C-alpha cells in the first residue's frame, strides 16, 4: 500500500528485482511484519544471562523491574548508551586508520601529503613545530599527536580551535569533557554492565561525554587528515543516481566508508595497463561509481559519479551492469553476498574489519596500497567478459550535482561579497552577517540514513525543500546529501526553483546552490567547524545561534552518536525516526526537555517532516529573539 521510494529509477529497478525473483531490503522489512514493541521502546535488556528481561513501557502496569532490579529508565538509558558507544567506535576506527596512514606517508610513497598549507595549520593545533622542518616529519608528528587522542591515559586531549571556549568550560562544569576516544567507549561499556550504573541522568551524561570523542576528535581528525593526504575539497561538478552506470563501460562501484581504498582505486583507474585492459575486453573504459560515504569522499575530491545512497545498494546489482562491487566497512548490507549470486557481479570485500561470508575477500594491503587497488580493480575489469548485455537494465535517470563545499571553500566563496576596503577576508563573517541581519533566518544541517520505516528519500526531500523555502540555508552530508543530489537540489538553478527570497538572494550573490553538500558523515565535523567559527566570531556560544540538525530517515548507531554530539555541542536536533526510548519516561524527559538546561539544546522526535520544518523555524526564531537578532 505504501510507496517504497520517491525516486523513479529506484522504483523501476525495484520492479526488475521482483521479476528476477531476488530479495531487497524492502522485502525483508515486510517479512519482519509487526516488530517487537519491547525492543522498539527500549525496555528489553540482554546485558547478562539472568535475562532476557523485558519490563512494561507503560509505567505502573505489568512487569516493573528486571531480575537484577533495573527499572525501565535504567534499561532504556543503558541500551541508548551502547548505541552511542557503537557509533563512536565506528567513527573511531575510521579516523584511527586515517591517522595511521598519515604516519606512514613518505615523499616517494603511495600515500603523500597533498595539502601542505592545511597540515601546517593543523600542526599549530597540536603544538607541532613547522618552521624549517621537512613536511613529512611534520605530518608524522601530527599523526602521533592525533593518535594520542585515541588512547592517552594521562593529560588532556587536543580539541580543534573552532570549538568555543564557552562550550569547553560548560562541559567541564557538567562533567562531560571528553577523554581518550577508546577510553570513553570502554567507559560506557563498563557502566552498562549488570550491577553498575542504574541512573538515567548519569547514564545519558556518559553517553554525551562519549559522543564528543566522535564529532570533535574521531570524525574531526579523520576529516582533517583525509584532507591533508587526499586534498581539501573544493566546489566540483558531478552526476548522481543510478543512470551514471554505462552499459558499454566497465562499471566498478565503490561502496563503504574508509577512503584510502577508493582513493587508490581512482588512481588505479588511470594506469595505462588497466586502461588498455578494459579496452581489450571490449568496453569503452573504466566507469567508477561511488555509493554512500566512500562515494561521497571521492566525489567531493574528484567528482566521481555517485551511483546512489544506502537503500539503493541492492538495486545497483539488479541493473546487471555492476562488474565489481568493492566494499570496505560500515553499512554494507550482508544481503549483497546472496543477491550477487544471481548476477555476474563479483562482490569483493577488502577490509578484515568486515568479512562477509560467501563474498570474495581481497585484502587491501595498506603497505602497498596502489599495487593492491590495482590487483582488485583488474579482477573487476576482467569480470566484464561475463556480462550478459541482454539482461542489462540501466534507467535513463541521472541528475547533475555540485558538491565539494568544505569549510575552506565556503569561506573562499564568501570572500566574493567582502568589500576590499571594509571587512576581513578568509573569515566566516559574511555568513554571520546575513544571519545576524535576518536575511537568512538560520542554518540547518540535514544528515542521516535511509530507513524502511520511511518512504526512502521522501523525508529528506520534504525537510530540505521546506527549510530552504523559509530562507534557511541547508547543509547536507551522507545519504541525505546524496538524496538531495539525486533529486536535483545540489544545483545553482535550485535557488529560484525552491528557495525563499533571502536564500535566493544570498545564493545569487555568493554563486552557490541553496543546499551545500559538505561531504561524508565524518565530514559532519565540517559543520561543527563552521557553526563554531560563527559562534566564536559573534562572541557567543553555539547554543545561542539559530542552527539546527535534522536526521529524517536515520538508522545507524552512528546517527545516534552523531545526533547526541550535535546536541551536546549545543545544536537542536530533529529525528525523523523514533529512537527506542519511549519505554523510559525519564529518558524521554532528559532527551526532549532537561537536555536544554544542560547544554542549551535538546532532541526533537518528529516523523512528519512538514511539522518538523515548522518546529525548526519556530525554535530558530525563538533563539533569534533571545539573542536580539
Amino acid at each position: 500500500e505504501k510507496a517504497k521510494s520517491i525516486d523513479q529509477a529506484t522504483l523501476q529497478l525495484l520492479d526488475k528485482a521482483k521479476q528476477d525473483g531476488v530479495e531487497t531490503v524492502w522485502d525483508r522489512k515486510a517479512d519482519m511484519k509487526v516488530q517487537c514493541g519491547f525492543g522498539s521502546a527500549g525496555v528489553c535488556c540482554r546485558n547478562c544471562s539472568m535475562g532476557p528481561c523485558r519490563v512494561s513501557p507503560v509505567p505502573g502496569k505489568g512487569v516493573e523491574r528486571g531480575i537484577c532490579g533495573a527499572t525501565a529508565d535504567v534499561i532504556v538509558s543503558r541500551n541508548f548508551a551502547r548505541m552511542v558507544a557503537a557509533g563512536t567506535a565506528a567513527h573511531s576506527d575510521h579516523g584511527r586508520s586515517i591517522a595511521l596512514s598519515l604516519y606512514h606517508t613518505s615523499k616517494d610513497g603511495d600515500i603523500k601529503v597533498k595539502d601542505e598549507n592545511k597540515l601546517k595549520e593543523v600542526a599549530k593545533s597540536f603544538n607541532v613545530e613547522t618552521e624549517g622542518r621537512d613536511i613529512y616529519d611534520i605530518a608524522h608528528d601530527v599523526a602521533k599527536e592525533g593518535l594520542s587522542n585515541y588512547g592517552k591515559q594521562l593529560g588532556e586531549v587536543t580539541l580543534p580551535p573552532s570549538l568555543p571556549e564557552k562550550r569547553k568550560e560548560l562541559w567541564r562544569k557538567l562533567g562531560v569533557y571528553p577523554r581518550a576516544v577508546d577510553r570513553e567507549i570502554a567507559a560506557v561499556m563498563h557502566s552498562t554492565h549488570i550491577g553498575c550504573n542504574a541512573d538515567a541522568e548519569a547514564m545519558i551524561k556518559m553517553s554525551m561525554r562519549c559522543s564528543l570523542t566522535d564529532g570533535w576528535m574521531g570524525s574531526f581528525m579523520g576529516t582533517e587528515f583525509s584532507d591533508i593526504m587526499f586534498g581539501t575539497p573544493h566546489s566540483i561538478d558531478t552526476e548522481a543516481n543510478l543512470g551514471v552506470l554505462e552499459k558499454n563501460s566497465v562499471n566498478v562501484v565503490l561502496h563503504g566508508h574508509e577512503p584510502l581504498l577508493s582513493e587508490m582505486v581512482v588512481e588505479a583507474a588511470s594506469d595505462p595497463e588497466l586502461v588498455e585492459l578494459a579496452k581489450s575486453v571490449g568496453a569503452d573504459g573504466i566507469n567508477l561509481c561511488g555509493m554512500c560515504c566512500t562515494g561521497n569522499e571521492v566525489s567531493m575530491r574528484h567528482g566521481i559519479k555517485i551511483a546512489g545512497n544506502f537503500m539503493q545498494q541492492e538495486l545497483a546489482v539488479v541493473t546487471g551492469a555492476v562488474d565489481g562491487l568493492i566494499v570496505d566497512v560500515q553499512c554494507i548490507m550482508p544481503a549483497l553476498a546472496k543477491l550477487s549470486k544471481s548476477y555476474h557481479t563479483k562482490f569483493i570485500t577488502t577490509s578484515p574489519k568486515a568479512h562477509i561470508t560467501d563474498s570474495i575477500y581481497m585484502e587491501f594491503d595498506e603497505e602497498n596500497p596502489l599495487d593492491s587497488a590495482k590487483k582488485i580493480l583488474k579482477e573487476a575489469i576482467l569480470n566484464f567478459k561475463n556480462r550478459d548485455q541482454s539482461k542489462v537494465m540501466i534507467p535513463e535517470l541521472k541528475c547533475k550535482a555540485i558538491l565539494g563545499y568544505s569549510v575552506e571553500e565556503i569561506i573562499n566563496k564568501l570572500d566574493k561579497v567582502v568589500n576590499t576596503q571594509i571587512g576581513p577576508m578568509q573569515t566566516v563573517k559574511p555568513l554571520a552577517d546575513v544571519l545576524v541581519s535576518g536575511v537568512l533566518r538560520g542554518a540547518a544541517a540535514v544528515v542521516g540514513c535511509n530507513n524502511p520505516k520511511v518512504v526512502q528519500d521522501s523525508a529528506h526531500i520534504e525537510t530540505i525543500k521546506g527549510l530552504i523555502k523559509n530562507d534557511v540555508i541547508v547543509v547536507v552530508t551522507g545519504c541525505a546529501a546524496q538524496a538531495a543530489a539525486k533529486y536535483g537540489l545540489l544545483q545553482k538553478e535550485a535557488a529560484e526553483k525552491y528557495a525563499g527570497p533571502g536564500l535566493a538572494t544570498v545564493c545569487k550573490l555568493v554563486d552557490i546552490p541553496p543546499v551545500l553538500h559538505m561531504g561524508s558523515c565524518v565530514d559532519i565535523s565540517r559543520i561543527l567547524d563552521l557553526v563554531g567559527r560563527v559562534a566564536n566570531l559573534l562572541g557567543v556560544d553555539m547554543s545561542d545561534l539559530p542552527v539546527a540538525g535534522v536526521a529524517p530517515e536515520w538508522m545507524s548507531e552512528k546517527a545516534v552518536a552523531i545526533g547526541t554530539y550535535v546536541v551536546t555541542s549545543g545544536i537542536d536536533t530533529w529525528l525523523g525516526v523514533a529512537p527506542p526510548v519511549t519505554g523510559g519516561p525519564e529518558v524521554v524527559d532528559i532527551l526532549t526537555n532537561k537536555m536544554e538546561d544542560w547544554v542549551g539544546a535538546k532532541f526533537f522526535i518528529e516523523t512528519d517532516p512538514h511539522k518538523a520544518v515548522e518546529q525548526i523555524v519556530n525554535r530558530m526564531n525563538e533563539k533569534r529573539k533571545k539573542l536580539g537578532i
Binding site: T420, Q421, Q426, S437, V439
Partner: protein, 708 residues
C-alpha cells in the same frame, strides 16, 4: 533592536508623518486642489512607477496612503523588508508632494528641491555613456566640516554626480565646495524625505530611456539596479526613519555605505569608519571603475610615453645590463605576510647621488596577496612591470627577470622623481589591471648591495628555477595548442608572435605556460589560443590554423608562417628581442649578437644596425629576433640545421649558455667542446679572419648543406 523591526518602525513613522501633512493639505485646500511637481510628465514618479496611475488632486494624495499601508507587512522575511522600504519611499513622495501643495515655491536655493524632467534628460545621457560613473547620494552629518568637503570634492573630482540631503549641505558650504548642476553637486533638501528627489531621478530615467511602462514596478527595479549607478552614504547617527529609507535604496539596488555601526548585509549595507578610504569602498560596492587610475607620482603617465629613447647624455641613473645586478620579482603570498600599500626603499635613493650618471643595483620585490591568486600567475604579473614602468615619462625598462635594464632620465629628477614613486605605480596598476585576483600589494625597491644579494638567490632565483623547470619537460609535440600575442602591435602592427613550449616569445618574458595563464585571467586579452591542426610540415612547423589566425590578427599583412625556419616565410620580429640571428653565407651558418654587446659583428653591422634589418613586423628571410632561452632550443632552426649553424657570438653569450648549449650539442651528436668552436670577439670579428678560425676548429656547419 533587530534590523527588520528597525526598518518596520521607521516605515510606520514614515507613514505616520505622511498622514499628518496630508491632513494639513485637506484642511487648508480641500480634497480637490491640484497636486503636481514642476515640469514633470509623470506626476508622482514613485507612485506612477508602482501603480501606473497619476495623482492629480488632494483626495487622490490622501487616498494614496493605502499604498504605503499595503507595502508594510511586518514579517521578518527579506521580501517584506524591501516592500517596507518601498513604503517609506512612497510615503516620502507623499510628504514631499504635500510640501508643494501647501506652498507654491516650498524650496528655495541653496536647496534645489524637486528635480524637473528636462534636467533628467540633460543628466541622463552622460549616465548611459558613463561620463558620470555613478551618483553619490550622501545624507546625514559628518563629524567635521573638513571631512565632509574632503569627500564631496573627491567624488566631484571623479566626475560623478553627488547629491546632498541633510546637515551636510551646511557642512559642504562651510567646506568651500561649490554647488550647481554643472558642478555635479546638487543639494536636495534638509529633511530626510528629500532623498526621494534622487530616487525620482533613477525612476524617471527608466521611464524615459528604458522605455518601460508605469506599473511595471519589478521591471523598474531591475532597470535601477542594473543601469543607473547609485549609492547612498549615510553619515552621523542613523534614525529609524532614515534606516527605513535605506531599505528603499536597497530595493532600487543601491548599496548603503555608512559610518554608523549597523547589522551589515553583504554588497548592500556596510560600515566604513575610515573616511579617507570611504570613496573607494563606495565605488567598489557599486562596481564603479574610473576611466583613469590615480597616480601619486608627479611625472606624466601615459601609454604614448612608452618607447621613449634616452641617450647617455640625458640619463640620470642606470640599473642592469652587464654592468649591475638588477632583478624584479612577483610572488604570491599569504594575506598576513603583506601590508597593503607598503612601500619601502632600502638603500641609496636618487637624492643621495649628486654626482654624474652612476650605476646602482636594483632589486624590485613585489609581494602580492590574493584569494584566488596562484603560483602559475606570477610570470603574468611580472610581465606587466615592463609595461607599467615604461609608461612613466623619463624612465625606460627592458629585459625580464634578473637580466633587466632600467634607465631614468634627468627630466624626471628635475621634476622631483623618487624611488618611492616606483611602488606607487606598481601598487595602483596591479590593482587596476587585476582587480579580481589581487587583494594586497607590497613593493620593496632595493638599491642596497647586501639585501640585493640577500634577496636574489633567496627568493628571486628559486622562483625562476622552479619556473624554468616547468617548461624544460615540455616539447612542442606533446601540446595541442599554441598561443598568439599582439601586445607589441602598438609599434609593429603586422607582427604576431606564436608561443610554443620550445619557441618562447622573442621578448623572453612570455612562455607557453605564461601565455596560457594570461588567457585564463583575460579572455579579451592579447594572448589567444590556436589549435595545432592541419599540419602540412612538421620539420619546419607550418600549421594551417596558425596561418588562419595570423592573417586575421595581422589584418591580412602576413599570409604564411613557418615556426622552425628563418629562410622560408619566417615569423616577424617586433623590437624587444634580447638577441638577433643573422645569416652569414661565408660560414654556411648564422651569427648571434645580443643587445648589450656594442661592437661590430662580422656582418659589418652592430646590434643597432641589425635591429633595423629584422624588426618592424616585416617578413625578413635570414634574420630573426629571439629571446635568450630560444638559443638552446631543439626546434631552433630545425629546418636549417639547428644550433649547429652558430659560428659567432660575443663572449658574454657563450658564458651564459655554456651549460644550456653544450647539452643541446651532445643531444645532436656534437662533441662537448661545441661552445668553444664558436668564434667570439676575443678571437676575430671579420669574416675573412673568422672563416680560417672555423676551418681550424673543424666546425660542423662547414660540412653541412648550404643554407640557400
Amino acid at each position: 533592536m533587530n534590523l527588520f523591526q528597525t526598518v518596520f518602525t521607521g516605515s510606520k513613522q514614515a507613514l505616520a508623518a505622511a498622514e499628518g501633512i496630508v491632513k494639513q493639505a485637506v484642511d487648508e485646500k480641500g480634497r480637490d486642489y491640484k497636486v503636481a511637481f514642476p515640469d514633470t510628465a509623470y506626476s508622482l514618479p514613485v507612485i506612477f512607477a508602482a501603480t501606473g496611475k497619476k495623482i492629480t488632486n488632494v483626495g487622490e494624495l490622501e487616498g494614496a496612503l493605502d499604498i504605503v499601508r499595503s507595502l508594510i507587512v511586518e514579517e521578518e522575511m527579506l521580501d517584506k523588508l524591501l516592500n517596507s522600504g518601498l513604503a517609506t519611499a512612497v510615503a516620502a513622495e507623499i510628504i514631499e508632494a504635500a510640501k508643494y501643495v501647501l506652498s507654491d515655491a516650498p524650496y528655495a536655493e541653496p536647496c534645489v528641491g524637486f528635480i524637473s524632467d528636462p534636467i533628467i534628460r540633460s543628466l541622463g545621457v552622460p549616465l548611459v555613456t558613463g561620463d558620470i560613473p555613478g551618483v553619490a547620494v550622501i545624507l546625514g552629518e559628518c563629524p567635521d566640516s573638513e571631512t565632509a568637503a574632503k569627500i564631496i570634492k573627491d567624488y566631484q573630482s571623479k566626475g560623478l554626480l553627488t547629491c546632498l540631503v541633510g546637515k551636510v549641505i551646511d557642512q559642504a558650504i562651510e567646506g568651500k565646495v561649490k554647488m550647481g548642476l554643472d558642478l555635479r553637486v546638487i543639494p536636495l533638501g534638509y529633511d530626510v524625505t528629500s532623498v526621494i528627489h534622487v530616487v525620482t531621478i533613477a525612476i524617471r530615467a527608466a521611464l524615459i530611456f528604458g522605455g518601460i511602462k508605469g506599473g511595471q514596478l519589478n521591471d523598474i527595479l531591475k532597470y535601477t539596479a542594473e543601469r543607473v549607478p547609485a549609492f547612498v552614504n549615510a553619515f552621523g547617527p542613523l534614525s529609524e526613519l532614515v534606516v527605513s529609507a535605506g531599505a528603499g535604496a536597497i530595493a532600487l539596488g543601491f548599496p548603503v555605505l555608512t559610518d554608523q555601526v549597523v547589522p551589515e548585509v553583504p554588497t548592500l549595507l556596510l560600515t566604513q569608519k575610515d573616511y579617507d578610504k570611504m570613496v573607494k569602498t563606495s565605488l567598489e560596492a557599486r562596481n564603479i571603475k574610473i576611466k583613469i587610475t590615480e597616480i601619486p607620482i608627479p611625472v606624466s603617465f601615459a601609454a604614448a610615453f612608452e618607447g621613449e629613447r634616452i641617450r647617455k647624455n640625458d640619463m640620470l641613473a642606470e640599473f642592469g645590463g652587464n654592468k649591475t645586478k638588477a632583478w624584479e620579482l612577483v610572488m604570491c603570498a599569504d594575506q598576513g605576510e603583506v601590508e597593503d600599500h607598503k612601500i619601502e626603499v632600502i638603500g641609496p635613493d636618487i637624492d643621495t647621488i649628486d654626482k654624474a650618471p652612476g650605476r646602482m643595483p636594483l632589486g624590485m620585490l613585489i609581494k602580492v596577496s590574493g584569494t584566488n591568486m596562484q603560483k602559475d600567475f606570477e610570470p603574468v604579473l611580472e610581465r606587466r612591470l615592463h609595461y607599467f614602468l615604461n609608461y612613466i615619462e623619463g624612465v625606460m625598462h627592458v629585459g625580464q627577470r634578473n637580466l633587466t635594464w632600467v634607465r631614468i632620465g634627468k627630466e624626471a629628477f628635475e621634476k622631483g622623481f623618487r624611488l618611492k614613486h616606483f611602488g606607487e605605480v606598481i601598487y595602483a596598476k596591479m590593482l587596476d589591471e587585476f582587480g579580481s585576483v589581487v587583494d594586497k600589494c607590497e613593493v620593496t625597491i632595493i638599491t642596497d648591495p647586501g639585501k640585493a644579494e640577500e634577496l636574489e638567490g633567496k627568493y628571486a632565483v628559486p622562483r625562476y628555477k622552479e619556473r624554468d623547470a616547468r617548461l624544460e619537460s615540455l616539447v612542442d609535440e606533446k601540446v595541442d595548442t599554441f598561443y598568439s600575442c599582439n601586445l607589441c602591435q602598438s609599434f609593429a602592427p603586422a607582427h604576431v608572435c606564436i608561443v610554443t613550449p620550445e619557441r618562447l616569445g622573442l621578448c623572453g618574458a612570455v612562455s607557453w605556460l605564461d601565455a596560457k595563464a594570461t588567457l585564463e585571467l583575460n579572455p579579451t586579452g592579447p594572448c589567444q589560443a590556436v589549435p595545432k591542426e592541419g599540419v602540412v610540415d612538421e620539420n619546419l612547423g607550418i600549421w594551417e590554423k596558425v596561418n588562419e589566425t595570423v592573417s586575421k590578427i595581422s589584418q591580412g599583412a602576413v599570409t604564411s608562417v613557418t615556426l622552425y625556419s628563418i629562410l622560408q616565410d619566417p615569423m616577424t620580429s617586433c623590437g624587444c628581442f634580447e638577441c638577433i640571428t643573422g645569416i652569414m653565407p661565408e660560414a654556411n651558418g648564422v651569427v648571434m649578437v645580443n643587445r648589450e654587446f656594442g661592437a661590430t659583428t662580422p656582418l659589418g653591422m652592430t646590434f643597432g644596425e641589425l635591429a633595423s634589418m629584422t624588426g618592424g613586423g616585416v617578413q625578413t628571410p635570414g634574420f630573426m629576433g629571439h629571446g635568450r632561452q630560444f638559443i638552446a632550443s631543439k626546434k631552433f632552426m630545425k629546418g636549417e640545421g639547428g644550433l649547429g649553424r652558430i659560428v659567432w657570438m660575443p663572449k658574454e653569450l657563450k658564458d651564459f649558455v655554456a651549460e644550456k648549449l653544450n647539452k643541446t650539442a651532445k643531444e645532436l651528436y656534437n662533441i662537448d667542446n661545441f661552445a668553444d668552436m664558436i668564434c667570439d670577439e676575443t678571437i676575430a670579428t671579420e669574416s675573412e679572419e673568422v672563416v680560417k678560425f672555423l676551418e681550424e676548429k673543424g666546425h660542423p656547419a662547414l660540412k653541412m648543406d648550404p643554407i640557400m
